[PDB]
């Protein structure tokens, strides 16, 4: 372990001592864009440092190349660096060309001090042992995994470090085997950065309703792909909401009251900001459980609505103007008429925040709006950089959406979320009708070669959204065995693909012994190994490890070698 | 054998649960502690007023603590039944510890206290068990049943109540290396709620259930003067507390009277005073407006009230029956009394406790100037009645000689030629004194 | 538990409008109800220097306390205070005491230096002779209060702390304290408080505490008298730790024995004052314990230690009467001495009266020595002779020793005489 | 509210019971019991000491109700018809009979005899004292006295009342020197109100269930009651530093005696305490009082309530803590008799040295426990009380082993501060 849960306050105090000078701005926060959890964590840090008047700079970085370029550009005065959402799975001192002898001051006296401190803050579990164990400059905000599940790796790393006959060589190979089996592991996510920073705030005592709301947003960002993590962290948020809500309950509503509530939040898509029919129709879970992509699915949906006794005219009405008779009986109606179709998991408990008279909104809807703003908010090596520039710019739109004074931007985000879900649904029914997903014995490939609005999928977030749609659809099919999926999308302007190796997941709400063990995404190591040999102009720079940009002509040989690769 | 026999736990400025999950364990001068149930157990939250020296924190709680006590160096938690106490210093250099108190049949911890020299735990039976900062026991003693506790930096003040001995207080200064005692089981003049507890009260029954004796707080002063607040809504200070023979219980504030005289004329009952601390006429107290005596989770701003003697007579105050007018004849006399008591209190800490802020001498000099100004006004008022003996008697308490010269001028101007010679004789006597 | 106004030596309404408020060695106050109000009548027992005067009242003061230079008046509720000095050189004044909701004034007292009024709640407000306030204090709830020339005495009762006496010497500028909030040993009437009594129900309802007088001795020694008919005193008032409580006089057995030693229950005595065992008191026979009728001559009854036993008395035996005289002289010896080294020689007879008291003390020792000689006890005589003070008394003890048929009796007293050298 | 039943009480009081076998008073020297021969009472006075205190019996016709034992006599008395029987064991001092003045409502509650004075209390609140010959010497009035036990020169006068509550008072009467230490201060003894077979009889015998009022081997006052605790005065000489430390807990201790379960037939009747040696009678049966003639009181060490509910294994971590607290509390008690009472038992210095050695041994065990706990601050606090410098060397030796460089240097810093002190 490097920084446990109980000693986050030590890191915060170290940051304050090193860089809380009003003379200059010696603190720089590197945030990974295209990550809602990192966005909420950086918003928390921004508010916390605004309270203590610690001058700081927030830089959205898209890829590892940008991180390296910025660090090279980074001045030596800046003596505190925060990496939010990345950096925990690579040799940062090696990647950034860091040698501790050039950053050490006042070596003496069993202590050491350095002129610059890098605090990595992410949730991807393959901690690089040369970062968590063998470097003092790099300081990792651990969540308790290393101090409990890395004892063997700690011993193996230290023995090899200190040792630089037959028994000695045999034991070295035995220890080196322990390190090797630690690697060759898929990259998962166990915690949410927002929850970690909220734990730090609880240690410092700066918790309030806005920070709790940011924590809820960051945690709810994990419910789509890491539902086990969200279910693990949910009781803590539930306790915090009860702790922070004022005792003056059942009071009259006033234009100033902000209420965090735990009320039934059905697992539909933008239920409060769109019609009930559109909430069922465009839901990922409902689509998986009913197969609405085919023609018979719409008939099933209409039959369900008739069964509940909700007229289609009322069902398609906007949620605000739905008749108060139906809107107040949603719980009873869903209890009576959902287990018939297997949608019992739709009913759920979530967090809903109302700001005075501005109407309710749930964290699930809020994160969809934020994601939409990230995705569509606003010869070959140059236009791609223009895309990176636009993608960085969208981070600030999603950042400004968090402010309560910019609801006119959150509504635009909601509209963009509805449009993007519509486009995702159209492309999904186009893929599943033409049977574009080629089943294999290693990975179910799927390449998007032509169609409409194909420029949406050059963004990694939109491609992951489509992949999550497909994976949710496949997960509820019993015949289809679990298998990694690959999505690609040709970028005509740059003549390059965007391969996004995904991971399968068990059906939502299905809790078993094998469900408890998380599924690990093995595509990162496979991609890196394939790129190391057989130079193919592959661009592996995303913080999301399992996403690469490959030339149009080099895609097929790359996939051939990947098929020959048994790593994944 | 009931009602007052219930030694239900009490902590300074406590609060009942009432009709919600929020409860205030303690409101010291340095912060407050609140508890909320997470539908199965409590989560403690400790906040501090002097943000800049401490940092608030909240932790999960499983034992369901009922007692708390905040110092400038650490806070102590207690339990009513099976009273496992917990002490946690604010700084991380000192490690917090927990201990289990010896519990007997019918026993229940009533109050807890802590001091940088020793930590003291109460007991319904009347035990006086004490430990060091780190939990090692030091001595076990039995006294009258302790019902409340409040400690300053080095001194501990407790009130003992029993159905046979009555309300008896005891102010003991443990000291760094000398356990110098100042009082022991001495009778106290606090009025226990008896008539008001005879099934005639609205919304006060729940609070009286929370605290049977109705004593709201036992906060000290900035100079170590013990103070008492309860149902009678009057502060009780110990003026000459250094000498046990010089024990003095002076009612320094009258909450109901002050509230009435600032409310415009109505005898309002919807205003309740929750004192926190007093520091040289600065009484910090939350003024809750409503039918609920205890405050809510958003603790209101600690509005400050000034000390006022209960010399205000209703007969004199209803001269303008309905900015309540004050009789100028009695207002100056009350200012005289306030200046007198404040000067006496400051002199005790001047030579003994030394300088505290570097301005005690100057404020004492200004207070003495006001003290003699009040004497001059009373002298003029007596001269207005053509009572030369009254003015002569009042002139013997003058401190500054310049005020005595002003008294000479008053005598020579207020149609009293005979007073001139006597005040001049007093001044000439003061020449050699 | 109920609190109602009361003054030292206070009398209840009874059946006549003429009600007396306070008895003093220099005066007394009687109130007459003229169908609308109580007219204050003040009359002095002293020489013509203290001139009797009467006036008309409208406020109806229910409290009174006389002194050597003025008398204070007040009421329980809305208790305006009017301390009118006896001398006409000091003009009187009127002022209104602060009061709370339901608060009542229980007792009043006056001092040459200050004036102090008690409250039911327990306030100890102190003023001056001209009405200007000086200090306000709080103690246990007061039921009665008495003030001397330089010191004051108050008794505090509450439903929890109960009876407790407070001794304070405010003085001109010296606040000498000796006993604060200390419990008092006076036994509250329990059998007498029962709802079955003859000619006493009115007083018990008016004064549930049962205390009748709270005056002082000549030397400022507090005296306590109540329905228990026991005269309490502060033996060692100078030392709070060494302070005692000796019943100087028991009214009941004294009035039982003076007439003929037979049974009697109508010789109730109202105490007036005390000055070196000159316990002047009202001797009224009948069903009017309080002086409802005009007070008779305050005839004196000297104190007597409660050593008398009913079995040995049911005339006085001469062998043990001198023992009681010995005990009285012994207990009064320190009482007479204290004035000499504390209050000075003010009466002027302290030296001669103390010499006479010590002479009688050693004479009683000699008489008990002869009695023990008749008992043929060497140890008793030796123990009694240990306390001999006068050398001539010791020589008389030696002379008795050689006569009372005892050889060992002589040698011990001779050794004691040698020790005197 | 009419609770005024102040029945007479004596140390180690015993109810009559179904039979006539009732103990008047039981002391360490001997026990006094009673039996009725259908017409009168027979008083059996025995002695547990050496044959010098020979057992003697006398026929009683007055029906004595109270008794008191002494090294030079024994007193007897009865509740009604106040009479006195201080009949000394030695024939050199002639026995005398004195008549106690009895009044209506008045009843004798307690008696106390000393070699220099004999004192009897009453429910009225009197402190009558008589000389060795029974002649009265000084009568004092206090709060209603219900218990009165005295040492050779010290008396622990306890006064109780409905309007005054419990109130202890310890005073020095002496042969001719009157000194006072504690007067009228309340005591924390617990009135039994929750509490029945064989219990209601004893409650009718005594209201507050006091068992005994014996003193220590060095004259330290002690009180034992229904709560089954011993109340000792560490700084009895100092009034402002008075301490009431619990010493033993019979109810708590009796749990682990039988089997660690709830037992009700192994009741304890303590007699006296002398340096951690308390002799107690292990009465077995439904009746609390010993119906049979009193057997030898089994010795038992003192244990203040440090144990917790959560032959029986005792935690060594808390066992040595309890021994530490015992040594600490007994250290000042042993030093009390040094400068004032001196050496009389010939072992005070040796027992003091052994107690100090055990005190520092418990200190060392606590230091080892804290070192195991790895608490630097706890060890630093524990190192501030080491008495013997050799124990300090042992602490240094432990410090160099308990894996703490700072521990070694801080213990050596304290030791070097002790080097030049």
From Swiss-Prot, chain A:
One of its GO terms (biological process) is double-strand break repair via break-induced replication. This is Cell division control protein 45. Present with 1730 molecules/cell in log phase SD medium. The keyword Cell membrane does not apply. InterPro entries: CDC45. Required for initiation of chromosomal DNA replication. Acts at the origin of replication. Also has a role in minichromosome maintenance. GO terms for cellular component: CMG complex; DNA replication preinitiation complex; nuclear replication fork; nucleus. The gene is CDC45.
Swiss-Prot record, chain D:
It comes from the Eukaryota. It is found in: Nucleus. WD repeats lie at residues 225-265. Accessory factor for DNA replication. It plays a role in accurately duplicating the genome in vivo. Present with 3280 molecules/cell in log phase SD medium. This is DNA polymerase alpha-binding protein. It comes from Saccharomyces cerevisiae (strain ATCC 204508 / S288c) (Baker's yeast). The gene is CTF4. The chain holds residues 471 to 924 of 927 of the full protein.
